[PDB]
Amino acid sequence: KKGSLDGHISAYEKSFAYMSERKIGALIAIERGQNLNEFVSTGIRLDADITSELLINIFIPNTPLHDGAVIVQGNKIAVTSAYLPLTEKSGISKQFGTRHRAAIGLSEVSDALILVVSEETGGISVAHNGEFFADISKEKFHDILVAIL
Amino acid sequence: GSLDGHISAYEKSFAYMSERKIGALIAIERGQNLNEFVSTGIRLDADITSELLINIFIPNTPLHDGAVIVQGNKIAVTSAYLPLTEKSGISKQFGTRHRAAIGLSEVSDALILVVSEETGGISVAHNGEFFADISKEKFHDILVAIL
Amino acid sequence: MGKYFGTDGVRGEANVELTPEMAFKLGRFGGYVLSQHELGTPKVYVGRDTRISGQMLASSLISGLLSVGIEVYDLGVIATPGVAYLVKKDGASAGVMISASHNPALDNGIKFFGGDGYKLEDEKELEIEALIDAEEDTLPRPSAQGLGMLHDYIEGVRKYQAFLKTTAEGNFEGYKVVLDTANGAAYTSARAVFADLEANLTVIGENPDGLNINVKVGSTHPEAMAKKVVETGSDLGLAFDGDADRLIAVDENGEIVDGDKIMFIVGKYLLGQGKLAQDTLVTTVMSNLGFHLALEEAGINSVITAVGDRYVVEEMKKNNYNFGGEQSGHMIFLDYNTTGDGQLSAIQLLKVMRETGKSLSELASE
Amino acid sequence: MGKYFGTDGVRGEANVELTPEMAFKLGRFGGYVLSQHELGTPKVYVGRDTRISGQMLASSLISGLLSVGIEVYDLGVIATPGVAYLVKKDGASAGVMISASHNPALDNGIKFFGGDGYKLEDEKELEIEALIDAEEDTLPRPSAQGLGMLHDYIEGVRKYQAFLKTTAEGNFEGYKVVLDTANGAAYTSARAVFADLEANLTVIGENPDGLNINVKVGSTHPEAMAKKVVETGSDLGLAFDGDADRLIAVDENGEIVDGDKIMFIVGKYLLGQGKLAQDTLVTTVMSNLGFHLALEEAGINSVITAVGDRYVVEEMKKNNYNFGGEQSGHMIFLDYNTTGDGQLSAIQLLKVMRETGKSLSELASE
Numbered sequence A: 001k002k003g004s005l006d007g008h009i010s011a012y013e014k015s016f017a018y019m020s021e022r023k024i025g026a027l028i029a030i031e032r033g034q035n036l037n038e039f040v041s042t043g044i045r046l047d048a049d050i051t052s053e054l055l056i057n058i059f060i061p062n063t064p065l066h067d068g069a070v071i072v073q074g075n076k077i078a079v080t081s082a083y084l085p086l087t088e089k090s091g092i093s094k095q096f097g098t099r100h101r102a103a104i105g106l107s108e109v110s111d112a113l114i115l116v117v118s119e120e121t122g123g124i125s126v127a128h129n130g131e132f133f134a135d136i137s138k139e140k141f142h143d144i145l146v147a148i149l
Numbered sequence B: 001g002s003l004d005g006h007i008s009a010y011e012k013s014f015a016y017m018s019e020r021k022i023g024a025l026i027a028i029e030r031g032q033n034l035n036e037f038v039s040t041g042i043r044l045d046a047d048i049t050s051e052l053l054i055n056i057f058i059p060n061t062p063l064h065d066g067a068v069i070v071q072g073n074k075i076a077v078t079s080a081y082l083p084l085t086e087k088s089g090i091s092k093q094f095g096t097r098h099r100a101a102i103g104l105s106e107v108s109d110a111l112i113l114v115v116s117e118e119t120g121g122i123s124v125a126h127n128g129e130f131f132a133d134i135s136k137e138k139f140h141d142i143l144v145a146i147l
Numbered sequence C, D: 001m002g003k004y005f006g007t008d009g010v011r012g013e014a015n016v017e018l019t020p021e022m023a024f025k026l027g028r029f030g031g032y033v034l035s036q037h038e039l040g041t042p043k044v045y046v047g048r049d050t051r052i053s054g055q056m057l058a059s060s061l062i063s064g065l066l067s068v069g070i071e072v073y074d075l076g077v078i079a080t081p082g083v084a085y086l087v088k089k090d091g092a093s094a095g096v097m098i099s100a101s102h103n104p105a106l107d108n109g110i111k112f113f114g115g116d117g118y119k120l121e122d123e124k125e126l127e128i129e130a131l132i133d134a135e136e137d138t139l140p141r142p143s144a145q146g147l148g149m150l151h152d153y154i155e156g157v158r159k160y161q162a163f164l165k166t167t168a169e170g171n172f173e174g175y176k177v178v179l180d181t182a183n184g185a186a187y188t189s190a191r192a193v194f195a196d197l198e199a200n201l202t203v204i205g206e207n208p209d210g211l212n213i214n215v216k217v218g219s220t221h222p223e224a225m226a227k228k229v230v231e232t233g234s235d236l237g238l239a240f241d242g243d244a245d246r247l248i249a250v251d252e253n254g255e256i257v258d259g260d261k262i263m264f265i266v267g268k269y270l271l272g273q274g275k276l277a278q279d280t281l282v283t284t285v286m287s288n289l290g291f292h293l294a295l296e297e298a299g300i301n302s303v304i305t306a307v308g309d310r311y312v313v314e315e316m317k318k319n320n321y322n323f324g325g326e327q328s329g330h331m332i333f334l335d336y337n338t339t340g341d342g343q344l345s346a347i348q349l350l351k352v353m354r355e356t357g358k359s360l361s362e363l364a365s366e
């Protein structure tokens, strides 16, 4: 948690945008009221600081870290071998795979505000702290990440 | 150090990259200086596991360029340029990445992880000497001798 | 062939018959044609085989299409079926692939993968012909605003690989295979695909150097992959085409398994399992006349479409059938992928050998 | 002068003055005039700015490069100094930078350099214009083996980043810097060079946008860099240009420190270390009269030539000195660079301020 992580938020936003133009759909985390570590204890974490190259090469599909989601703490994301708990409701739009529905589940159960790039839904959408938003502007994502980073 | 997990993970990652023909040239240091040549490239200081190594050495990717230099029971390098060799007996069939792996044989004091991106043959040139095209058990014996 | 379109796009020799400036023109005017039929900015794809002179035509067409406004994201070195599957999966409005398959290295393909997901529609070809036929180039040339940046799509190998692992339909592990890359479309994704089934892999010609495409390996002289099958002692064979569309293989004995023979094997494994829910499968009269006799003995009804897969796909869309093709090996499982895919055909054959109990030494004997 | 190529090469409005088709003609014509005097297949390198239309013309030139057999191992984000240094240390035969520099995004500028280190001479551009303006078509087209294949030199930019760091010859730590790329090409080398040098990082307009290169930030609008450096307490402020051709300085007092003051500071620092010249440093007549008066009082010999950076380079090469710089900001510090290098000039200025200890406020005394 520093200004280096504050700029790493912008770097992660740039990586998510370059994924959105290339449909590299994955899910990430930023803790927002409780630890994800109980759900983040599944695999071999990294705790390496959030860098553009590391995430942009990690969250690609058909590779050793395609499955699951990215879990983070501090200035670092704990690799990718551990996703949060999925949802339990069905009144919301059913227009996505595990990614958007499971991130909204992390909104529903955890207090998270999780950035989750969409392959099944194309763009980037934010579910946050018991609420959500869909397909928002790049400036909205940057402002949200800077505010709740 | 009793690196029965670290060397096993590096061996498993190397075999996984060799069979599927993943092209890279990685390294882990030894009892001499290796940080000055490593500070040039991008930094991750990543925790060491075989799956993350296969991820970082995946071809046509963001971190797919340059060597992977490791210190201790972890890895910290991304695209840091190693010093090339000057010995005359460099194999032309050995790649320029393999030539760079041969670079460390006289300006460092360690081994490397050399995987051919054209045929997948095994290669190592450490402590001045070398060992090439070793099998999985033979490279396992090489890493046990490294420990 | 229209005013400037060939049979499956543009087929010819780069910088010998076709012109690189004409390739940029067929990119730009084609971009205008694509822009004049869809609201919003058209998002397309691009692909090319590993031909030696191939990259020049793809670069010229990518530069030409970059001006018309449709920001063509490009993904070089990938299969044509992979490019089509990515175009129909990620949400593309168009696509491009470049491959010539059975032809020698003196020519390279140019194929505009249409927005439908099948081959390019007639209206798109007519519009591209019109915009390359008129004299003036009246396309809207954006100076700064509206220009399309070239976003590289180097992750295009990953999605096309991911279409194979879903089409595995169970593991192909344990068996021993031979995959001759033929310095073509198999040089990028097919080695990782056949390895991704966790089987023993023996590759031939997987170190392409550009000018080695379709030379002494592949669907032009399959005796070499059979000699490698005999020496390596693997069970089944696999010898891809130039664009990973066609398929052929040698058995563990070394003989030649026909494309209609692979069709009969896949059809028996289908009609036994009930997956081919349109059980009267399509067929081509370009195969041997005894192949239809074998089909009639097998108890599967067959129709006759013209030589080539265009009218085959047309009849597949007309009468709503799933499997049907020529004798080249295009086992186009239309319920599993977009179009002719040699990797998908090899995956289906591996599934047949895995589930049928009997090995490949008994499937082709029907 | 050439009809399109001029002083700083060819600079015309994209898709208005120089057509991209003419660029695909120009790259091939430049190849067919590049391979005249070398032996074998000669090599080159290419770089460009961050403009959205910059990628289109560079892609067209790369497409034309595969017409006469010009093998390219190039990049897409570097300064003209980067391509010059790569040409000097790579032993290649050509180097081209695609950028319109200080102008707006409505035009792009393609100019081929000289492999020796300076710009290309009169004969090269004259023969290229002769080839382009020739009515007929005589450029050979390599179809068989002999045509090259393009390669990515993404690891090659690290050489340009290290060489400037090597030419610094001293850490840039301590002096808290505020770099100003301002949607140029310094987002690829300057940020990494300063971060490796243990300096301070605060960059305004460091993110390229496509139509924001040299727009309301940079060499043609230095207000934002000075404002942010004053607001963030920067002890030193430096700014670059779109093509990084010039260099401008942001003082601690919130004023504007220009190229004449930069040249005076560099000349005094080289006078202290005994590396200015024999006795004479070059000078453009467009500098302020106070600058030349302070130079005359300083005692270093001043020579005035024709207005223009090309005349500055010619005077530097003829007068056997080792420095030359016009008040716009193009400073040929040939003791560490092949040609005009804004980043190397800023590195030399920061090392001068570190070694001498003279204040940022008093650096503009002469």
Ligand SMILES: Nc1ncnc2c1ncn2[C@@H]1O[C@H](COP(=O)(O)OP(=O)(O)OP(=O)(O)O)[C@@H](O)[C@H]1O
Residues within 6 Å of the ligand: B023, B024, B025, B064, B065, B066, B067, B079, B080, B081, B082, B083, B084, B094, B095, B096, B097, B098, B099, B100, B115, B116, B117, B118, B119, D155
């Ligand atoms: N000094 C170096 N430090 C780090 N990485 C290097 C160095 N030199 C080369 N490389 C790496 O190797 C690549 C070039 O090596 P090259 O691919 O020619 O060899 P190879 O893979 O061993 O052989 P082949 O090309 O025959 O498969 C570079 O792109 C880079 O990733």
